[PDB]
């Protein structure tokens, strides 16, 4: 058995339990679920606009962390090149299933003004870890799905709450190779598409502005099965 313990040869006396930083900082860190809800960078894009209802960029919504986009050799996304993957997939690497919600809080640029619609599409499957990333009848606005418009003129950030709309017990969590054909419905919570409502004369002001997306799990996430960590890379040895 793994955590069996035959002959304890302790030398220690009683160490005072601080309660995971309670007795020093006035706050607990025993539960990792409430650390999971600190917002983490999810993905970052640069708008290359190449109609009003065309979805400007789409991304599958998943707590696993996306397929990491460093970038090209010339302009790497300096956090995703340097500071690898953050917290939430570093914990999700330690599990196998999840069942819960997500939050997003998409941060738009400021120079854009036009009103923005956001769709949640639980229809669209994920078709493997390749192209499980931000992608600049799918290509347009759709009627029936859960929608939300944020006005950029008032506040250029839309806070979301993506529920758990899957016909599963719980979903997959590691990297996903598209093994079975219907197992592809077992990864994402859906497929969010952000689309501007600017015309063609205004859309050129919006080209090459950063749109950063955050995420956090929000009160419902329950990572179920324990699975050990993969090989890691130490960051201060990066050249």
């Amino acid at each position: 058995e793994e955590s069996r313990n035959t002959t304890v040869l302790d030398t220690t006396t009683t160490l005072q339990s601080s309660g995971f930083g309670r007795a020093f900082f006035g706050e607990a860190f025993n539960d990792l679920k409430t650390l999971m809800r600190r917002y983490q960078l999810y993905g970052q894009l640069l708008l290359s606009v190449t109609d009003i209802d065309h979805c400007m960029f789409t991304f599958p919504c998943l707590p696993q962390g996306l397929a990491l986009d460093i970038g090209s050799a010339g302009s790497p996304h300096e956090i995703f090149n340097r500071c690898r993957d953050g917290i939430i997939p570093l914990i999700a690497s330690g599990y196998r299933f999840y069942r819960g919600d997500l939050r997003y809080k998409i941060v738009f640029p400021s120079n854009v003004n036009s009103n923005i619609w956001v769709q949640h599409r639980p229809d669209r499957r994920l078709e493997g870890w390749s192209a499980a990333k931000i992608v600049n009848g799918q290509g347009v606005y759709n009627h029936g799905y859960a929608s939300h418009i944020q006005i950029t003129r008032v506040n250029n950030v839309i806070e979301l709450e993506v529920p758990f709309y899957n016909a599963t017990c719980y979903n997959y969590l590691q990297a996903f190779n598209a093994s079975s054909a219907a197992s592809s419905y077992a990864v994402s919570l859906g497929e969010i598409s952000v689309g501007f409502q600017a015309t063609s004369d205004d859309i050129a002001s919006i080209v090459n502005k950063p749109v950063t997306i955050y995420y956090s799990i929000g009160d419902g996430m329950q990572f179920s099965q324990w699975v050990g960590y993969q090989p890691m890379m130490i960051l201060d040895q990066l050249p």
Partner: protein, 248 residues
């Protein structure tokens, strides 16, 4: 206290595990490791056809993999990446006959959708002078991962819970594997929404932690046996056996 009296019967006391009509014995105590609690039956939510377990035939044990394990196998050597609801059938096809010929798996031929928990007893028959240690580890849904080839080593499977098969004491490894999957039923044949990767709960894989070490006159080989029970099973979707394709 430690009062030996060997005889014609031997010294130790034999323990058992009796099932339907298959009784297998172990001299040694099992190193049980249970990755997850026992599951709820899930036949209420998704089945109107007649669900009937077959505890007289399905809960029998069945040997699915024996293999020689030599000392010349290296440090982190795979021995058997058994996919348990697949290797039960594909070992029967490794005996070069149909699935209908075996009493343990005839509901897989008739019924379409399997659920249930699986016991695994990996017996070993090492000599007492042999020194080596294996680990039996269960990993849910192996083929759904792509980085698992970088994880498939003893340093990764010793973090999740697992059984240990020491060749020193000829240890035996009970392994209670409950059904956990994305969908609450595994399909046993070609199926309208997935065909590739059929009847695949995960992977019992038995890496080597430290190999056999012995003297120059030592017994080199070490046979290893794997048994599987299918205890709290159930089946649904009565269908024709002519739709059952052969496993990969």
């Amino acid at each position: 206290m430690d009062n030996p009296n060997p005889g014609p019967d031997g010294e130790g006391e034999v323990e058992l595990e009796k099932d339907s009509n298959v009784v297998l014995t172990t001299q040694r105590d099992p190193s049980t490791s249970i990755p997850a609690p026992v599951s709820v039956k899930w036949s209420r939510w998704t089945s109107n056809d007649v669900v009937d377990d077959y505890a007289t035939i399905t809960s029998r044990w069945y040997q699915i993999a024996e293999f020689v394990w030599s000392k010349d196998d290296p440090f982190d050597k795979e021995l058997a990446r058994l996919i348990l609801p697949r290797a039960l059938l594909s070992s029967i096809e490794a005996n070069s006959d149909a699935i209908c010929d075996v009493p343990n798996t005839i509901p897989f031929k008739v019924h379409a959708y399997w659920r249930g928990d699986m016991e695994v007893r990996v017996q070993i028959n090492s000599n007492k002078f042999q020194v080596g240690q294996l680990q039996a580890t269960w990993y849910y849904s192996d083929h759904e991962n792509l980085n698992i080839s970088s994880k498939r080593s003893v340093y990764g499977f010793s973090q999740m819970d697992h059984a240990l098969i020491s060749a020193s004491a000829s240890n035996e490894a009970k392994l209670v594997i409950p059904f956990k999957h994305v969908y609450p039923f595994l399909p046993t044949r070609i199926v309208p929404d997935w065909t590739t990767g059929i009847l695949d709960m995960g992977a019992l894989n038995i890496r080597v932690i430290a190999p056999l070490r012995m003297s120059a006159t030592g017994p080199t080989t070490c046979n290893v046996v794997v048994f599987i029970k299918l205890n709290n099973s159930e089946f649904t979707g009565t269908s024709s056996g002519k739709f059952y394709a052969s496993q990969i």
